[PDB]
Amino acid sequence: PNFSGNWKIIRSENFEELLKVLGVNVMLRKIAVAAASKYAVEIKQEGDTFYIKVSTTVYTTEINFKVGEEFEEQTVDGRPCKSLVKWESENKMVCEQKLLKGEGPKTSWTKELTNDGELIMTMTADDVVCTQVFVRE
């Protein structure tokens, strides 16, 4: 599997519902949904080490990790967390997150490379799953 690429979003489902679970108010939810229709994920993969840059029009952030090694990032709604990525299969990884301070919904994400050349990213907060689909530029 080679996740490396400049990925462009083509589909985003249930993102507003995810943000609702996370306590984002309705107006900012709609604005965030609009930002998601634009956004890109750049991946550089070397073996089990991943460099990921997620960007929208006005914001960019970097996720760096090695599979199986704890690291710190933020949840979708922006709360700092400790994260651990594991493979679920040849082409799919899963990340469990634990809040660094306080409580909140159980969050996680997955990244999958399909046989058709798509990247599928899911983000979960409790029972609500957002699914996002990208293609390479």
Ligand X SMILES: *C/C=C(C)/C=C/C=C(C)/C=C/C1=C(C)CCCC1(C)C
Binding residues for ligand X, rule: CB under 6 A, are 32, 35-36, 39, 41, 52, 54, 56, 63, 76, 109, 111, 121
Length of the chain: 137
Identify which of residues 103 and 122 has a Cβ nearer to ligand X in the complex: 122
Minimum distance from residue 43 beta carbon to ligand X (Å): 7
- Among the listed residues 83, 113, 73, 109, the one whose alpha carbon sits nearest the alpha carbon of residue 94: 109
Q: Report the distance separating Cα 98 and Cα 93, nearest Å.
A: 17
Nearer to ligand X (CB atom), residue 21 or residue 109? 109
Q: How far is the CB of 13 from ligand X (least distance, A)?
A: 12
Considering the complex, state which of residue 4 and residue 56 has its C-beta at the smaller distance from ligand X.
56
Q: Please, which residue, 52 or 113, has the CB nearer to ligand X? A: 52
Report in angstroms how near the CB of residue 32 gets to ligand X at its nearest.
4
Least separation in angstroms between residue 42's CB and ligand X is: 10
Distances, alpha carbon 31 to alpha carbons 16, 28, 61, 133, in Å:
10, 5, 18, 19
- Is 131 in a helix, a strand, or coil? strand
20 vs 42: CA distance, rounded Å: 27
